[PDB]
Design an enzyme around this catalytic site. Structure first.
Site, PDB file in Angstrom:
ATOM      1  N   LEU B  30       0.796  -1.219   0.000  1.00 12.24           N
ATOM      2  CA  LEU B  30       0.000   0.000   0.000  1.00 12.24           C
ATOM      3  C   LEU B  30       0.832   1.275   0.000  1.00 12.24           C
ATOM      4  O   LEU B  30       0.442   2.250  -0.655  1.00 12.24           O
ATOM      5  N   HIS B  31       1.973   1.287   0.696  1.00  7.35           N
ATOM      6  CA  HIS B  31       2.762   2.509   0.835  1.00  7.35           C
ATOM      7  C   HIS B  31       3.470   2.890  -0.461  1.00  7.35           C
ATOM      8  O   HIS B  31       3.485   4.068  -0.837  1.00  7.35           O
ATOM      9  N   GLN B  32       4.072   1.916  -1.146  1.00  2.54           N
ATOM     10  CA  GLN B  32       4.708   2.159  -2.434  1.00  2.54           C
ATOM     11  C   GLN B  32       3.714   2.536  -3.521  1.00  2.54           C
ATOM     12  O   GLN B  32       4.047   3.350  -4.387  1.00  2.54           O
TER      13      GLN B  32
END
Lengths: 293, 189
Positions: B30-32
Site C-alpha cells: 500500500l505505501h509504495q
C-alpha cells in the site's frame, strides 16, 4: 466389536526438502547449473537473509511419492477390526473413482498453494512440473497460478490428465513419481522467509530449505466440507482439526462430524456418513496417525 | 466532507498467514502504491476500530474520487490476495456524513534514546547517563497492527497508532502518505 487400540497408516505424496536458490531470466532453460541462496545474521542475535541485486528469481526443488492401496492398515490388535474395515474401504473404492481427491491435489500442484508466502506482492507466477520415469522426462508440463483462483476448485484442461495419473497412483494402478519445482519473482534485494525449528531460520548447509511437512501439508488442502461457513476456502485435513492462522478450530468434537465418530460409524456398523464427507474421510486415511483407544 | 468516495470491501480466509501475515504485506503493497504511484486524491481511513479490542482491520474503508481513486477497481498492483481478500468500488455518499480522527504517525519509546543521541551530540556514555535522561518518559503506544519485520530481526513489531475524536464538521484536502490525518479530518463512515 469395538474400536482399535493401535492404528498406523502410511503417508502419501511425500516431498523432499524445497531448497531455495537464485538466478535470472532467460537462463531458466539452463537451470541445471545455477547458484544458490545465502544465510547471514545481523544485529539480540537473530538470522535474516536476502537475495542479491541481479535477481528477482527464487527457486524450489522437491519430488513426490505415491504408494497405492491406502485403505489397508499396518498396525492393529483386532483381527475382527480388519474384517470389519475391509468391507468399508472396498465399498468406498469400487463404487466411484478417486478423481475428486485428485483434482483438489493436482490444482494445488498447479497453483501456488505451495508457494504460500512467495506471492505476497508478486506479479507473474510460472510453475513447471515434471513426470519422471527414468533418467529423462517424458510427460512434461508447465503450469500457472494466476488462472485458477486460490480458493475455488474449478478445473481446466491440464488438470484431468494429471488427476487420472495420480488417481492411478494412490489407488494402486501404477506408481507415479512427480517432481514439482517452481521459479519465483521476489524482488531485487528482498528478504526471505524460510522455515525454522521449534531466532534461527532453518539452514541446510550452503542453501536454505523448508521441511517436508509444510509441502505435505500444502498439497492436501482438501477440507472444504467443514461445517460452519463454506465461502471461505480450502483448509487442510486434520482429525480434531485446529488451525492457528484462522484461529478457530473447525469440526469440533462436541457435535458429530469429527473424524473419531464418523470413522466409528462409516467403518464398523456399515451406516454411512454423508457423501459430502467421504473424500475428507479418505484424506484422513491418506494422512495417517495413531488412532487408538 | 465534499468527496463522496466510499468503497466498501470484505476479507477472505487463508491458512498460510495470520492477521500480521497479511498486514505486513498490506504495509508493503500500500505505501509504495501511495508513494511511487501516489495520488493526493486517494487514501484510507479507520472508522471501525477499538482501544481494548484492538480492531485494526474489519472492512473496506477508503477515500477516493471519480478520477483520483477511480483506478481502485481496475488495478493489477493489488493482485495476489485472491486467496485472502477482495475490494469494491465507490458509491454515492449522502449530505450529512461523519469524519473520524486517525493518525499514521510514528511513536517513539526510547529510554536510551538520550544515550544514542548524546553519543553523537554530548559524549555522555552509558556509565553516567542515568542522571537526568528520560528513563520512563519514552512510553509505548500499544495498539493492534501488523508485524513488519525489517532487517533488525524477524519478529513481529507492534504497529503504534493514535486514534482521534468525532466531529460533525469536515475538512477536505490532503493528508499524510499513510492516510492518517496530519491536519485533515479523516473519513469514518
Amino acid at each position: 466389536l469395538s474400536t482399535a487400540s493401535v492404528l498406523a497408516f502410511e503417508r502419501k505424496l511425500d516431498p523432499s526438502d524445497a531448497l531455495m536458490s537464485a538466478g535470472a531470466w532467460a537462463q531458466r532453460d539452463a537451470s541445471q547449473e545455477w547458484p544458490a541462496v545465502t544465510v547471514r545474521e545481523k544485529s539480540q542475535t537473530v538470522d535474516v537473509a536476502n537475495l542479491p541485486s541481479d535477481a528477482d528469481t527464487l527457486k524450489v526443488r522437491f519430488t513426490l511419492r505415491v504408494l497405492g492401496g491406502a485403505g489397508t492398515p499396518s498396525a492393529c490388535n483386532d483381527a475382527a477390526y480388519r474384517d470389519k474395515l475391509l468391507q468399508t474401504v472396498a465399498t468406498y473404492v469400487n463404487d466411484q473413482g478417486f478423481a475428486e481427491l485428485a483434482r483438489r491435489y493436482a490444482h494445488n500442484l498447479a497453483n501456488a498453494r505451495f508457494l504460500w508466502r512467495n506471492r505476497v506482492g508478486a506479479e507473474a507466477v510460472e510453475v513447471r512440473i515434471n513426470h519422471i520415469r527414468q533418467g529423462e522426462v517424458a510427460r512434461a508440463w508447465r503450469f500457472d497460478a494466476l488462472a485458477i483462483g486460490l480458493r475455488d476448485f474449478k478445473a481446466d484442461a491440464e488438470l484431468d490428465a494429471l488427476a487420472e495419473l495420480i488417481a492411478s497412483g494412490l489407488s494402486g494402478s501404477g506408481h507415479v513419481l512427480l517432481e514439482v519445482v517452481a521459479f519465483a519473482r521476489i524482488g531485487d534485494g528482498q528478504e526471505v522467509f524460510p522455515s525454522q525449528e521449534l531466532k534461527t531460520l532453518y539452514s541446510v548447509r550452503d542453501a536454505a530449505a523448508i521441511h517436508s511437512q509444510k509441502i505435505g501439508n500444502a498439497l492436501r488442502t482438501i477440507d472444504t466440507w467443514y461445517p460452519d461457513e463454506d465461502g471461505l476456502g480450502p483448509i487442510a485435513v486434520e482429525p480434531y482439526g485446529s488451525v492457528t492462522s484462522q484461529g478457530k478450530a473447525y469440526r469440533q468434537p462436541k457435535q458429530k462430524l469429527d473424524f473419531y465418530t464418523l470413522l466409528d460409524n462409516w467403518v464398523l456398523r456399515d451406516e454411512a456418513p454423508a457423501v459430502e464427507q467421504q473424500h475428507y474421510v479418505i484424506a484422513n486415511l491418506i494422512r495417517g496417525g495413531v488412532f487408538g483407544e | 466532507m465534499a468527496m463522496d468516495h466510499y468503497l466498501d470491501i470484505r476479507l477472505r480466509p487463508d491458512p498460510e498467514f495470520p492477521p500480521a501475515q497479511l498486514m505486513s504485506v498490506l504495509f508493503g503493497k500500500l505505501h509504495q502504491a501511495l508513494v511511487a504511484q501516489g495520488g493526493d486524491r486517494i487514501g484510507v481511513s479507520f472508522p471501525d476500530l477499538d482501544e481494548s479490542r484492538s480492531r485494526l482491520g474489519e472492512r473496506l474503508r477508503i477515500h477516493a474520487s471519480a478520477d483520483d481513486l477511480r483506478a481502485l477497481l481496475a488495478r493489477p498492483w493489488l493482485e495476489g490476495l485472491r486467496d485472502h481478500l477482495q475490494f469494491g468500488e465507490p458509491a454515492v455518499v449522502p449530505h450529512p456524513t461523519p469524519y473520524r480522527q486517525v493518525s499514521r504517525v510514528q511513536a517513539k519509546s526510547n529510554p536510551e534514546r538520550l544515550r544514542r543521541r548524546l553519543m553523537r551530540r554530548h559524549d555522555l556514555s552509558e556509565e553516567e547517563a542515568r542522571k537526568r535522561i528520560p528513563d520512563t518518559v519514552a512510553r509505548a503506544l500499544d495498539l493492534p497492527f501488523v508485524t513488519l519485520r525489517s532487517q533488525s530481526t524477524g519478529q513481529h513489531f507492534r504497529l503504534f497508532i493514535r486514534h482521534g475524536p468525532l466531529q460533525v464538521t469536515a475538512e477536505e484536502g490532503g493528508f499524510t502518505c499513510y492516510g492518517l490525518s496530519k491536519g485533515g479530518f479523516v473519513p469514518w463512515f
